[PDB]
Ligand binder design. Structure first.
Ligand code: MG
Ligand code: MG
Ligand code: MG
Lengths: 52, 113, 71
RNA sequence: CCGCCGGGCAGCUUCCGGGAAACCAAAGUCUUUGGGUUCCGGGGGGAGUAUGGUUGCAAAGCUGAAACUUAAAGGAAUUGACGGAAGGGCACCACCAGGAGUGGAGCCUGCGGCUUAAUUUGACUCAACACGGGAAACCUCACCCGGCCCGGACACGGACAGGAUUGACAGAUUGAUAGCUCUUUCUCGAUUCCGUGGGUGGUGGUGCAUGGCCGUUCUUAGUUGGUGGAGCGAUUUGUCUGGUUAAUUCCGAUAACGAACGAGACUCUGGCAUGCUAACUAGUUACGCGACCCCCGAGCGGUCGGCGUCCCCCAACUUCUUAGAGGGACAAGUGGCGUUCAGCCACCCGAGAUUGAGCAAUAACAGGUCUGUGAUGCCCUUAGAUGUCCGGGGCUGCACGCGCGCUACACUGACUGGCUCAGCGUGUGCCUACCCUACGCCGGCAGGCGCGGGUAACCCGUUGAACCCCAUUCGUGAUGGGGAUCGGGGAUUGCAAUUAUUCCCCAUGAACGAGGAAUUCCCAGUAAGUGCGGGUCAUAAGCUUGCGUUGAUUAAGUCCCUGCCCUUUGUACACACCGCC
């Protein structure tokens, strides 16, 4: 309900967010190949350097 | 209203729609509010299916008098051929591919290749 | 609702006074300007800044309108 | 018994033909108008009245006006819709069988009222009442007692200079260091000011001027068309006697046949998956156990039981964790029952055909919403402004009334030791100034003061909880339950808490010993208790929405009340019985 009234019904607004992650060992080619390809839809990609 | 929304509804069907509807709620040549609804073809009105099949769209319209609502609600016939139409089947709908061949009882025989 | 009676004391919207202001400028014989009265301490109001006698007030008006004291 | 014949009482049936229609061998032969003849009606009432005449023993009978008023009254059939009609069917917003309560007390806050300057206000059965996310000091906030401020767009007019008054540091004041105003004047300097029209807002007005969004009739089974077939035609069948079904869902009888929306299918979810793909942002698992390792403990010692760690890892793995692909469960088998169809019931293997929501048609309704909307019609109002605010105040006020909550009434319990089991979340560093918190001291405690991790599956955090569970008091005393109302301190948030902010520490220490008339809630991991998150948050919840946790009794059917679906029927109702009269 906008405003007050009517028998009290609510909605149950949901958004999921699954995280995958993949470890690897490479140079600055294989990272910059594999990351820039396979992009496109609503997908965020992080790239950690090493360990921390 | 009349001639216009037909002009729309005509079009959207002729374009290539499974079905469609238009609603023009609001005051309409009278101090009282009417609600008009001109409909054509097929339309599913429940389920998840609705979510990725109908193309709902509300728009107001602010006129020299007051305010009407448009509601266009088109049904997409990408069920036939999206290219791979998402799911394609409305889950109700099953397509049984037909016997095709299944010829010959006959006497036995053999062959070699 | 109510309809506003108003205690009969219709408060004054006031003019900031008319005033030509700059006639009182002592030109003693040839061209030279300086009178004396009370002064303000501000920077944009540099030394020339000038004061008064009212029913009390006195004010200084020269960091454009920024800075009137309390006398 | 079987025929025929006349004239009698009657029946069915039909596209004669009639018939407004219902119907009618006759109401048939009627614009294709008249076989004979009798009576008799000309909108409704007034009125079968008045008056006159007559008959009668009289009730009364017979004959029988008008003024006036009146727009329909009426008839036949249609859908409605309601029956204190009838069959069928169904809902725990229904009942049964109960428990839990609720309705009683105190307290909370919701409204009503009174009171009050003000207690702004929307919301009025149900589908208004901890609802407007409505837990409000200040803001909120609109509202009152004031009081400031202008943020008067825009244009159109008016104002070159003896500078249009842009903008003014000490006092009179004022609340204010509001030049907002009463002299003084010292600068920006083409702004300014004053008209006119016109805006611009307004948590002003109107939700019967509207958009959207919502609520609901109503998670109830319903709704619709193409072609047929019926009706001159509105309409009607298809759309249904019965069995079935959560469900016009199905099969079948079947002037219908095959279709469409709703239901169903779907999505999310919830549970079987030593089956797969894997995972230092899970777990890890158990190792291998290589250890530290202290007798942590067993044991003379070998050896072992075990938390912790020393880990790391170039173990190994997914046994639980996680989340991807999968599978499966599908009335699937067998035995009843069943028109032996549609299915129903029981049992087998096993999750037995139903784990729980979201989505939800046609069509509605002055439901609610203009105060969620820079959605807004028109209206008001428009500078002294209902434009925006500062300060305060109110929204909290109190002889009464109701509404949702909590806590109790105690000993299956009360307070006194102790042991010890999560889940869904949540978190900083965020759109304008702001968290989550681990571990040190200090203090009783609120807390305080130290310091640490944390875009988080890492840090909080083996989330170390309450009931619960276990260890002692107490003895049925309004008692140690209960725990209101006040006395006094101390912290914290906040610029500020007076109008106890919130918290702590003291201190007082109430009614209630199971609730009068009523009435909602629901069947399985269900009611109840029980904390805990989230939402609300500077401060903060007795609010909701989720989450486990502990976990019952009982129905497993019926329509007995209330209310819903179809069918048949009646209906002077169609503002639909809360009607009409
Ligand atoms: Mg006749
Ligand atoms: Mg005739
Ligand atoms: Mg007449």
């Amino acid at each position: 309900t906008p405003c007050g009234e009517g028998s009290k019904t609510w909605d149950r607004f949901q958004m999921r967010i699954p995280k995958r992650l993949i470890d690897l060992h490479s140079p600055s080619e294989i990272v910059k190949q594999i990351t820039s390809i396979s992009i496109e839809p609503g997908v965020e990609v992080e790239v950690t350097i090493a360990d921390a | 209203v009349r001639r216009a929304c037909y002009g729309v509804l005509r079009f959207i069907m002729e374009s290539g729609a499974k079905g469609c509807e238009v609603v023009v709620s609001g005051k309409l040549r009278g101090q009282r509010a009417k609600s008009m609804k001109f409909v054509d073809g097929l339309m599913i009105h429940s389920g998840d299916p609705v979510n990725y099949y109908v193309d709902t769209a509300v728009r107001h319209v602010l006129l020299r008098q007051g305010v009407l609502g448009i509601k266009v609600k088109i049904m997409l016939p990408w069920d036939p051929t999206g290219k791979i139409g998402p799911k394609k089947p409305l889950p109700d709908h099953v397509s049984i591919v037909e016997p095709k061949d299944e010829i010959l009882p006959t006497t036995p025989i053999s062959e070699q290749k | 609702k109510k309809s506003y009676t108003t205690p009969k004391k219709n408060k004054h919207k006031r003019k900031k006074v008319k005033l030509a202001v700059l006639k009182y400028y002592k030109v003693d014989e040839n061209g030279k300007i300086s009178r004396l009265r009370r002064e303000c301490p501000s920077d944009e109001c540099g030394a020339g800044v000038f004061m008064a006698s009212h029913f009390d007030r006195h004010y200084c008006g020269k960091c454009c309108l920024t800075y009137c004291f309390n006398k």
